[PDB]
């Protein structure tokens, strides 16, 4: 129950439960498959 | 992009990668397997330690120099002291095993040299004395050290003459046994998978060795100018599908 | 649902003869050996549930800090300018004997902290102090002065309440394993001299207290009492109750030349 | 003895046999690990569990 | 770092040995990285020993 | 949901050899290089959410 | 014609027969079982030597005399040196096991005496010094010898006072732990099956013992007239469902 | 009504109403019937 009118006044947000490290761990242009050779 | 050339073998808790392989040999085209009931005789249930014995043990390294004649290890002897493989070995009456052997030797594109890596089932050695002199136990159970074919004749030991395979046959014909070459220009490792080969379903691991692994320089090592004149050779071996049976008190063996 | 009606018996089936050597306690009832009448239980055994047994607040710790001029104090910790406590449930014995009736125990904790002030020497008044209790998990910087950067507590839970009031919050089961070990017959490693019995398996964090107020002209003693209530209790493997007195947090050791714990009869074995 | 780009480099010697290249314990919150991003984040938490990936790139 | 809770050691040795080509010399180096597997769990947040201060900063 | 069961390997497919020069961190797991058994995560990563990290 | 009285336990390559048993206790009514995946944490495949470790080891015998106070063994310590069980123990990082304990003591229908045989999960001992003196490692790792409660206090050792269970609780209440009596007039053996009890799924076998087995004379031994005044007590124990994990180099432990 | 998000913050648990002393009072391997002889 929100007792207040504005959105800033609500409690903390709830877990992204998004999670996708590939923008950080695999930003390569041509896709690399694990097990296939790195450099062909 | 798979090449015959790069390989990974993972066995137990240990992994080997080679980026310069030349395929791998599987003796007699058979892969190690456990002992089937139809072939069984001893009524005892066997023990299969699995991953604690079926991992890769790297023996101490050898040094190939221009004067090297070749080295010889016996199995299961070479592993008589490796981790739990060895304990099991001394503690059961009977045991059985296959192996993956990986011999390693890297150099550069200026070196030349070529080793023969061969597995000989039942390699009965000859006494250098001739006649019917026997080869004492200790001499055929060198352990991880193996036998150094360029060491001197000793008394009660085997002959160490390379053109004769330590038994009255010519080096040239060893190629009838499962084998692979390490030619610095091609190759940097050799891998052979050994299935269990015997005339009985299971045997004693201490009174009888069932294969000798032999690494022999054939085209002499030739290093580039002002290079150090030697390369180390390393042997890593992994028991596979090992089974032990008839547990008890723990064998005591000569020396 | 307590006793059924049962009458005379003349059988070949004797429920009262057993062999205790077996380790069992055979479930014998009044009606196996006297003639009984029906009666009902009228009772459920509600208040003997382990959640109930371990579920009331017990005092687990009393400490004390003071508000005074820190000017020229070389060791705040030592002047009780602030104070820490590594959480335990085995320092005051009442709750300890209760928990050690079990080997492994798992529960959430609810802490209540009461703080009261004392002014043992001449003051014009009673000041109103705010206490800060910081939860300091192992690896966090520990306070060195009563007003260190540590007290910023940007990542470490801390509660601010007033002396005279009470603070209350609840911490989930923070054990590293599946349960807390009430006992541990081990070492932290195979060392020849490492400590025996005391283990991290029991570790529940640690807490640092201080007054936020600067000093007034008089000095004020604030004494902190931490109460702990187990909620969501789970207990495994009952053990024999503690008979001798306790000597140390975390060891089973009892004092030497202790006194006989079994009351001697005033009379014979035959005495009533 | 002072932070340098060189403490990122593990040296290798030609022609040594059998010998040891480096050693470290695995207290990820201390010692070599401590300034790494992993080490640096682990330090915001009290407990860790899981597998680590250690890789070596040859130059 | 805690004993009971300790994780092991990591070591590295020559398996055969480094060999340099002609006309080449000296030491070669390995770079080493660390990251966590997807396996990893971290819990119970707290304050880092990696940063502290003695007076508030100003502009 | 942490590790699957995996046994001996003798392949031409080596997931542990990579080229870090590329800038990627290849997602290698225990089961690519030792023999593993199944285990579950039992965990969600709740307390490492940025809302939680900056939210006290 | 089955009696509670006669029994046979065959485990591995070893069998025990008792013709005068008093049922058998299974701690907490649970039988030893392997570690399920849902409960697993370490990702390593475990090793299950089976019949080579799950057999019966008979520890050296004790002598009950009229002055005996009682003996105490810790598990897995007591077995730290038995055959391949012990090797596995020193060689893996973690291991887990349940046991069958069989305590034996026979006499005649003229003797009297009664022993309590009890298993205590997590038996943390007390220092006889009091205060917060610790009990050094060696003292809580007596090996097959176990601890002799009628031996003298030693320094760094535990207290050996029987009315207090070596921990501040009364002998009389040990009956809350799985236990069985050996009453010469009834019984001649005691058998207890111990499931693995811990707060973690698998643990170290050397830094932590998870049960102490305790044999305590309670009704003093009384031999017939002009009989020798003593009886031997023998303890035989068999690991069951053992699993080892995290193999490596081989632990080195104090003393 | 829980006012709080985390489970630790809820009140005491509610009675097991489990109750089974046999793991403690009768951990024998072969079942003993009351009335039948203890040792056969």
Annotated resolution, angstroms? 2.9
Tell me the shortest Cα–Cα distance from G228 to chain C, in angstroms: 25
Distance CA G133, CA C89 (A): 20
Distance CA C179, CA C103 (A): 9
Question: Going by beta carbons, is chain D in contact with chain F, meaning 3 or more pairs sit under 8 Å apart?
Answer: yes
Of the residues F7, F33, F37, F41, the best mutation for testing chain G's interface (the one with the most G CB atoms within 10 Å of its CB) is F37
CATH number of the domain to which H19 belongs: 4.10.80.10
Distance CA D29, CA D41 (A): 9
Distance CA B127, CA G29 (A): 65
Q: Cis ω on the peptide bond leading into residue B222 (within 30° of 0)?
A: no
- Span G1-255 CATH architecture: Sandwich (2.60)
Angle C54-C111-H4 from CA coordinates, rounded to 5°: 100
Of the residues D12, D17, D20, D56, the best mutation for testing chain B's interface (the one with the most B CB atoms within 10 Å of its CB) is D17
Q: What is the 3-state secondary structure (H, E, C) of G192-206?
A: EEECCCCCCCCECCC
DSSP structure string for G27-50? GGG-------GGG--S-BPPB--G
Give me the residues paired with residue D57 across strands.
E31
Residue where the block lists tokens 């390559």: G13
Tell me the shortest Cα–Cα distance from F39 to chain C, in angstroms: 16
Distance CA B176, CA B194 (A): 15
Query: With 0-12 CB in 10 A as exposed, 13-18 as middle and 19+ as buried, what is D24?
Result: middle
Buried b (16+ CB within 10 A) or exposed e, A21-30: eeeeeeeeee
Tell me the shortest Cα–Cα distance from B61 to chain D, in angstroms: 7
Taking an 8 Å cut-off on Cβ atoms, the answer to whether G45 and F36 are in contact is yes
Taking Cα atoms as reference points, which of F45, F53, F49 lies closest to residue F1?
A: F45
Distance CA C154, CA E47 (A): 7
Which residue in A17, A26, A39 is closest to F19 by CB distance? A39
> What is the sign of the dihedral through the CA atoms of B183, B184, B185 and B187?
positive
Residue A5's alpha-carbon distances to A1, A2, A12, H3, in angstroms, are 11, 8, 16, 20
Which helix (H) or strand (E) is C96 found in, with range? helix C93-99
The answer to whether G144 and G72 are in contact (CB under 8 A) is no
Taking Cα atoms as reference points, which of C108, C57, C229 lies closest to residue H9?
A: C108
Q: What is the 3-state secondary structure (H, E, C) of chain B?
A: CCCCCCEEEEECCEEEEECCCCCCEEHHHCCCCCCCHHHCCCCCCCECCHHHCCCCEECCCEEEECCCCCEEEEECHHHCCCHHHHHHHHHEEEEEEEEEEEEECCCCCCCEEEEEEEEEECCCCCECCCCCCCCCHHHHCCHHHCEECCCCCCCCCECCCHHHCCCCCCHHHHHHCCEEEEECCCCCEEEEEECCCCCCCCECCCCCCCEEEEEEEEEEEECCCCCCCEEEEEEEEEEEEEEEEEECCCCCCCC
How close are the terminal C-alpha atoms of chain C, in Å? 36
Experimental method: X-ray
Distance CA B240, CA C172 (A): 48
Distance CA F32, CA B10 (A): 8
Residue window 17-56, chain F: list those with CB within 8 Å of chain E: 20, 25, 27-30, 41, 43, 45, 47-48, 52-53, 56
Q: Which two tokens stand for residue C214?
A: 């600067």
Of the residues D31, D47, D48, D49, the best mutation for testing chain C's interface (the one with the most C CB atoms within 10 Å of its CB) is D47
User: What residues contact residue D16 under an 8 Å CB cut-off, 6+ apart?
Assistant: E14, E17, E18
Number of domains in chain H: 1
The answer to whether C51 and H10 are in contact (CB under 8 A) is no
B228 touches chain D (CB under 8 A): yes
Taking an 8 Å cut-off on Cβ atoms, the answer to whether H22 and G178 are in contact is no
F15 touches chain B (CB under 8 A): yes
Is residue C61 helix, strand or coil? strand
User: What residues contact residue E57 under an 8 Å CB cut-off, 6+ apart?
Assistant: none
Which helix (H) or strand (E) is G84 found in, with range? helix G83-91
Which helix (H) or strand (E) is G86 found in, with range? helix G83-91
Taking an 8 Å cut-off on Cβ atoms, the answer to whether E4 and C154 are in contact is no
Is residue C95 helix, strand or coil? helix
User: A6: domain range?
Assistant: 1-40
Contacts of B13 in chain F (CB under 8 A): 34-35
Of the residues G101, G134, G178, the best mutation for testing chain C's interface (the one with the most C CB atoms within 10 Å of its CB) is G134
Query: With 0-12 CB in 10 A as exposed, 13-18 as middle and 19+ as buried, what is B169?
Result: middle
The answer to whether C17 and H38 are in contact (CB under 8 A) is yes
C172 touches chain F (CB under 8 A): no
Q: Which two tokens stand for residue G25?
A: 């206790």
Q: Cis ω on the peptide bond leading into residue C68 (within 30° of 0)?
A: no
Query: With 0-12 CB in 10 A as exposed, 13-18 as middle and 19+ as buried, what is C214?
Result: exposed
The answer to whether G24 and G178 are in contact (CB under 8 A) is no
Q: Which two tokens stand for residue G105?
A: 């003591």
- What chain C holds in terms of domains, given with CATH numbers, is 1-272 (2.60.120.20)
Q: Which two tokens stand for residue D12?
A: 């290798």
SS3 content of chain D, % helix, strand, coil (to 5): 25, 40, 35
Q: What is the 3-state secondary structure (H, E, C) of C1-30?
A: CCECCCCCCCCCCCCCCCCHHHCCCCCCCH
DSSP conformation class of D14: B
Distance CA D41, CA E22 (A): 45
Residue where the block lists tokens 């299935």: B195
Full strand arrangement of the beta sheet holding B14-18: B14-18, B7-11, F9-11
Tell me the shortest Cα–Cα distance from E16 to chain B, in angstroms: 6
Distance CA G243, CA G39 (A): 14
Tell me the shortest Cα–Cα distance from F31 to chain C, in angstroms: 25
Distance CA G211, CA G140 (A): 12
Contacts of F45 in chain E (CB under 8 A): 41
> Which subunits sit against D, judged by 3+ Cβ pairs under 8 A?
B, C, E, F
Residue D28's alpha-carbon distances to D41, E8, E43, F46, G99, in angstroms, are 10, 11, 15, 22, 37
Which helix (H) or strand (E) is C169 found in, with range? strand C166-171
Contacts of B6 in chain A (CB under 8 A): 37
Taking an 8 Å cut-off on Cβ atoms, the answer to whether D53 and F53 are in contact is no
Contacts of G22 in chain H (CB under 8 A): 39
SS3 content of chain E, % helix, strand, coil (to 5): 0, 35, 65
Tell me the shortest Cα–Cα distance from D35 to chain F, in angstroms: 19
Give me the residues paired with residue B120 across strands.
B212
Taking Cα atoms as reference points, which of G162, D45, G77 lies closest to residue C138?
A: D45
Q: What is the 3-state secondary structure (H, E, C) of chain F?
A: CCECCCCCEEECCCCCCCCHHHCCCCCCCHHHCCCECCECCCCCCHHHCHHHHHCC
Looking only at the bridges linking them, the beta strands covering G25-26 and G189-194 are parallel
Residue window 14-43, chain E: list those with CB within 8 Å of chain B: 14-17, 19-22
Contacts of F7 in chain G (CB under 8 A): 45
Distance CA B135, CA F20 (A): 54
Which helix (H) or strand (E) is A22 found in, with range? helix A22-25
Buried b (16+ CB within 10 A) or exposed e, F26-49: bbbbbbbbbbbbbbeeebebeebb
Q: Which two tokens stand for residue B50?
A: 């699995």
Distance CA C144, CA E42 (A): 27
Distance CA A38, CA F15 (A): 9
Looking only at the bridges linking them, the beta strands covering B189-194 and B25-26 are parallel
Q: Which two tokens stand for residue C166?
A: 């009470």
Angle H40-C30-G171 from CA coordinates, rounded to 5°: 70
The answer to whether C50 and C231 are in contact (CB under 8 A) is no
F17 touches chain B (CB under 8 A): yes
Is residue G88 helix, strand or coil? helix
Give me the residues paired with residue G190 across strands.
G103
F49 touches chain G (CB under 8 A): no
Residue B172's alpha-carbon distances to B162, B165, B188, in angstroms, are 10, 9, 22
How close are the terminal C-alpha atoms of chain F, in Å? 29
Contacts of B108 in chain E (CB under 8 A): 19-22
The answer to whether B88 and B159 are in contact (CB under 8 A) is no
Contacts of B63 in chain D (CB under 8 A): 17
R_g over Cα of chain F:
16
Taking an 8 Å cut-off on Cβ atoms, the answer to whether D51 and F29 are in contact is yes
Q: Which residue of F has its CA nearest to B15?
A: F33
């Amino acid at each position: 129950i929100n007792y207040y009118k504005d959105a800033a006044s609500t409690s903390s947000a709830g877990q992204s439960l998004s999670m996708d490290p590939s923008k950080f761990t695999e930003p390569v242009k041509d896709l690399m498959l694990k097990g296939a050779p790195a450099l062909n | 992009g798979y090449s015959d050339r790069v390989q990974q073998i993972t066995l137990g808790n240990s992994t080997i990668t080679t980026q310069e392989a030349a395929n791998a040999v599987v003796c007699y085209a058979e892969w190690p397997e456990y002992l089937p009931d139809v072939d069984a005789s001893d009524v005892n249930k066997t023990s299969k330690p699995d991953t604690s014995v079926c991992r890769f043990y790297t023996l101490d390294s050898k040094t190939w120099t221009t004067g090297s004649k070749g080295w010889c290890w016996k199995l299961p002897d070479a592993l008589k002291d490796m981790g739990v493989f060895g304990q099991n070995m001394f503690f059961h009456s009977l045991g059985r095993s296959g192996y993956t052997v990986h011999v390693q030797c890297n150099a550069t594109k200026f070196h030349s040299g070529c080793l023969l890596v061969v597995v000989i089932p039942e390699h009965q050695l000859a006494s250098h004395e001739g006649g019917n002199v026997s080869v004492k136990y200790t001499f055929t159970h060198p352990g991880e050290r193996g036998i150094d074919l360029s060491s001197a004749n000793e008394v009660g030991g085997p002959v160490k003459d390379v053109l004769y395979n330590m038994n009255g046959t010519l080096l040239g014909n060893l190629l009838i046994f499962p084998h692979q070459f390490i030619n610095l220009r091609t190759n940097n490792t050799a891998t052979i998978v050994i299935p269990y080969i015997n005339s009985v379903p299971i045997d004693s691991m201490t009174r009888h060795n069932n294969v000798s692994l032999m690494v022999i320089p054939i085209a002499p090592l030739t290093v580039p100018t002002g290079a150090t004149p030697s390369l180390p050779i390393t042997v890593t071996i992994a028991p596979m599908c090992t089974e032990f049976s008839g547990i008890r008190s723990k064998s005591i063996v000569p020396q | 649902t307590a006793s059924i009606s049962s009458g005379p018996k003349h059988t070949q089936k004797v429920p009262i003869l057993t062999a205790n050597e077996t380790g069992a306690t055979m479930p014998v009832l009044p009606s196996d050996s006297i003639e009984t009448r029906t009666t009902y239980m009228h009772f459920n055994g509600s208040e003997t549930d382990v959640e109930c047994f371990l579920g009331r607040a017990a005092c687990v710790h009393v400490t004390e800090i003071q508000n005074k001029d820190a000017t020229g104090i070389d060791n705040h910790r030592e002047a009780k300018l602030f104070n820490d406590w590594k959480i335990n449930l085995s320092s005051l014995v009442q709750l300890r004997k209760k928990l050690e009736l079990f080997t492994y125990v798992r529960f959430d904790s609810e802490y209540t902290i009461l703080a009261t002030a004392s002014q043992p020497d001449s003051a014009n008044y009673s000041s109103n102090l705010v206490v800060q209790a910081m939860y300091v998990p192992p690896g966090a910087p520990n306070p060195k002065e009563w007003d260190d950067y540590t007290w910023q507590s940007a990542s470490n839970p801390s509660v601010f309440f007033k002396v005279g009031d009470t603070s209350r919050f609840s911490v989930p089961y923070v054990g590293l394993a599946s349960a807390y070990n009430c006992f541990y017959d081990g070492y932290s490693h195979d060392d020849a001299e490492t400590q025996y019995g005391i283990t991290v398996l029991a570790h529940m964090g640690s807490m640092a207290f201080r007054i936020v107020n600067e000093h007034d002209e008089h000095k004020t003693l604030v004494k902190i009492r931490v109460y702990h209530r187990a909620k969501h209790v789970e207990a495994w493997i009952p053990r024999a109750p503690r008979a001798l007195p306790y000597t140390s947090i975390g060891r089973t050791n009892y004092p030497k030349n202790t006194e006989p714990v079994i009351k001697k009869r005033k009379g014979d074995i035959k005495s009533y | 003895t002072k932070d340098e780009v060189n403490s990122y480099l593990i040296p290798l010697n030609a022609n040594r046999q059998n010998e040891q290249v480096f050693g470290t314990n695995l207290f990820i919150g201390d010692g070599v690990f401590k300034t790494t991003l992993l080490g640096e984040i682990v330090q915001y938490y009290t407990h860790w569990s899981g597998s680590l990936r250690f890789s070596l790139m040859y130059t | 770092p805690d004993t009971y809770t300790s994780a092991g050691f990591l070591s590295c040795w020559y398996q055969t040995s480094l060999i340099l080509p002609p006309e080449t010399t000296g030491q070669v180096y390995l770079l080493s990285f660390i990251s966590a597997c997807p396996d990893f769990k971290l819990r119970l947040m707290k304050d880092t020993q990696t940063i502290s201060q003695t007076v508030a900063l100003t502009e």
